[PDB]
Symmetry: C4
Subunit: 267 residues, 4 copies
């Protein structure tokens, strides 16, 4: 219809994006001011009303989008679903999550990512790069599990705060992989009791730092290439063809002229 089309043009405009971005920023600022314990009752009450007004603006925005695109059309996008979930969660008073309680209202500042297309493309590149590093990440997980079982059995009885159980071992091995006080804080005190403990910890460090750097580089290299392609597509409608595809078409043109020269010209 004409009306739904007039709304789609309004939603897709730069001005609408700018108003929504400004309200996300305002909402983030009021939640940031609400961390201050020294504020008066009236000051807190004022900021809480600004939070409610921001949330109402988002309800109008999402409802406006659901009508303009349709229920199936709106929920077809993962970003629209995220926008819907983030806003709808705040309207629910009794919440049943899978952790403790979603009292973190500040997570609605993540809508800056979903609303700004250049920011959206950065997160998209990162998310799309994840399956390609799955096996490297699985290898690191396997190394961690093996190491945590070994560390618990080896050092749990003599260093129970750091290695007393599997959970404690995983945590201090994560600390060890980040190189944080690994020697002065952990391994030299362990070696005072277990002089050969360096045979466990030094290969653990060498293996995990190499694997985690492989994991991070694999993510970054691929996320950068995906985002660059998505940026090209968002501006021109297409992306740059890979070097292999350019050389393929170059070879096809050479095969076409070879046939035209050997039989269609040399006869």
């Amino acid at each position: 219809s004409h009306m739904s089309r007039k709304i789609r043009d309004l939603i897709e405009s730069k001005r609408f994006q700018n108003v929504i971005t400004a309200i996300i920023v305002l909402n983030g600022a009021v939640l940031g001011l609400l961390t201050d314990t020294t504020l008066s009752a009236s000051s807190q009450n004022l900021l809480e009303r600004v939070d409610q007004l921001c949330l109402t603006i988002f309800i109008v925005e999402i409802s406006l989008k659901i009508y303009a695109y349709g229920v199936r059309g709106f929920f077809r996008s993962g970003w629209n679903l995220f926008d819907f979930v983030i806003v709808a969660i705040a309207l629910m008073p009794a919440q049943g999550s899978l952790s403790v309680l979603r009292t973190f209202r500040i997570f609605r500042v993540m809508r800056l990512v979903s609303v700004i297309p250049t920011m959206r493309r950065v997160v998209q590149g990162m998310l799309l790069a994840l399956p390609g590093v799955g096996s490297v990440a699985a290898l690191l997980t396997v190394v961690f599990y093996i190491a945590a079982v070994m560390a618990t059995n080896l050092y749990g009885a003599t260093f129970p705060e750091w290695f007393g159980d599997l959970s404690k071992s995983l945590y201090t091995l994560f600390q060890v992989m980040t190189l944080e006080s690994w020697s002065m804080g952990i391994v030299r005190p362990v070696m005072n009791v277990h002089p050969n403990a360096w045979v466990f910890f030094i290969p653990f460090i060498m293996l995990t730092t190499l694997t985690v750097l492989n994991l991070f580089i694999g993510i970054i290299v691929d996320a950068m290439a995906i985002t660059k392609e998505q940026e090209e597509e968002a501006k021109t409608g297409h992306h740059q063809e890979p070097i292999s595809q350019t050389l393929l078409h170059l070879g096809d043109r050479l095969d076409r002229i070879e046939k035209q020269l050997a039989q269609n010209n040399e006869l």
Copy 2:
């Protein structure tokens, strides 16, 4: 005019660049010697006169440049403006900045960058690479803000030195992202009171270290490519054409011979 042209040749020469570089080095050395608290009144007075003589040489240099290129011509370059600002600021006695007070005379050693073309090209590559990582940098800023609001609300009342307010939280989360005493100094003491605090800090570390490495690699890769192109242009007048452009012209030559063979030869 002839005179302005004789001065332009003097300014653009290697010998003039070498004299100016030597005076920047001398000025840096005297400001370095002036940090020594044990120096006598006469020794300090002597060094302060050397600083004044260096500054006078720079005034002559900049005035010589303004005449040789013209007011609009000189200020057309960002490096000349920087050179002008750095020198002119020192001649002002009552200073009104946006911080505290610009008593840091040693910042005039940054003119080594503006005067040496190879050093200038390194900084140019770095500055020109900044817009391309803007969205990655914005993502890191968003993650930091969200995390600092969460950390203040979660740990501010029990760990007020580290998380008592937003500013304290941002600072210790920056420390946490750099992995500096993150566990022994911050997270194990926090976990003594909040046993599940690792659910906040370990994903914070994983996310920020990956993003900051993405930010740094994005800067370095692009700065290197920009500087390499600028170095090529400064020596030959042009830079190396991208592989895609070389393959494009190769394809155009193939299309030109295909037309010349199918109709201009096979008829």
Copy 3:
């Protein structure tokens, strides 16, 4: 034979891989639960029987493989040998290794790598990349040995816990290379006695961090390229030809048409 072929089809299937993966996971879980010191006698006895059942499933699996491929055919693969060794070691009660004792049953969780082809290809890429960094790794080893001899002679008598002998020096230089408390924990206390010790430690850090990063990057870059090729071969039967080889064949096609134009057409 038909029977050996029916077994080869069973072994090579996705369902068989999934059952073996599930049993490796179950075995890892029971060994993880066995780290818990609070468990009763009956609970420990139950888990130990689950470990025995998992091990019996692996014996059947390996025996089934030896028959289906043949003794020479099975042991032709390094992964099958690893699978054989890992399982067979557990059946030996008196063990004579080259360290202390192979009581680390959790190492059989490494079979997740050997059984999952995508995980197997990651480790293969890493192992195949090792000879190419051999000289960089040898250089780092040489720098470490020289530095440890120098550190022992220079600081052994005044700092015997850190540098009293070659073994202690190698360990604290490894700690120094990882930047862990290098200054506050090691070098500022050493400088209190040897004021010029920074002349040794700062170049040691600069050299080893650059070399270890060269070593890690060399591994990662090559492991990534090898794994990518192996992934391509496992799915299509072949891998992508290098750019140099594509340009070589493109040049050969140009030489073929040049001969066909100069003599076979211009005569």
Copy 4:
């Protein structure tokens, strides 16, 4: 002459390289054993004779090389000069260097690099990559000097152990750049007195870590490419032509056939 040629063939052989490598290894082992303070007089005397025998083998080796290649021919190589200097220094009893005293005999283990061609090529790649990062390294040096002057003036009077003079400031800023206890050890104690000190230290960290990573990556990328080319040249006599040069010759072949088709065929 025939005799000088028979010696050149002996020197250039794999067996001679293997004997020299073995003696460098033996010499490194005896100097490593000599770090042990518990050794008897006879044991120390025995090892010192093995060191003398190793040194005599090197004198014969170098003299054999000087005759076989000639004085100008031998000293034409930087590796031969290094080999000469390292050996000749040990024969001098009263030594006048530019530091304290060259009592570090273990530095002759660096001959493993000069004698093994694959190790030699790694160091060559690293050394040849240094001029190309000169400007990045100069930028880091400039940032360090400016920062050390600022830190001395700002914090020298209140934190004299860390910033009391230029030398102390450079050392703790190097520690700060490596992120070692930068916050818990340095910046939080400084902020207790100077609450805005984070305005100095956080931008210092951001700038230096980015620049040092740019410096390291620039070295590694170029050293890898140089070493790869040198490895190709040592085995085949030539190296792989750059992609740009391959595309240049491909374009030249297209221009040659275009002339042969437009005028030599279409007339």
